[PDB]
């Protein structure tokens, strides 16, 4: 019972970071494949991230402090960036390869790393500002990134292509009111009886 997950309260919405991300084959019904992989990888909770650019599952375990109904912060940010792209190499365009770090309302930071529109396996992390920046710089060294998207203060880091962005800018809304999309929610991975 590691209980490493701590909910992120953003207004009325309860988000989580730290899912394990698994790209799917695209050869089988995506949900059924995701369920099979969850059993093998030993996770009892999942979210599906599906659109024209991605077919992936984000996984967690109840024993690690995650729960059905927790909203995937990664799912939200991933889709938001899929929708708006980013400015890099002289134009606003889709950004398949992006990294970012965002300040959270309680002082923690979220770190994201996405390649070919899909999260890297551990590219969804929440913790201290210092460790988030450390992870950011570490993945950045690999190269092949379109853009760094995140907290405006990261301007100062001197990344080649930087896109300032706050989580608040990305949340979908009803006028001023944040909307929750149901698909962000972790749901139980159904298992047959033995
Ligand atoms: K994976
Ligand atoms: K796979
Ligand atoms: K494949
Ligand atoms: K997440
Ligand atoms: K995406």
Residue numbers in the entry: -1 to 192
Q: What does the paper behind this entry write?
A:
We here-report work carried out on PilO2Bp, a component of the Tfpb R64 thin pilus variant assembly machinery from B. pseudomallei. We show that N-PilO2Bp consists of two α/β sub-domains separated by a prominent central cleft, typical of actin-like ATPases. The function of PilO2 within the Tfpb assembly machinery is not documented, however, PilO2 is reported to be an assembly protein that localizes in the cytoplasm in the absence of other Pil proteins, translocating to the OM in their presence. FFPred, from the PSIPRED website, predicted the most plausible topology, with a cytoplasmic localization for the N-terminal domain (1-194), a transmembrane domain (195-214), and a periplasmic localization for the C-terminal domain (215-432).
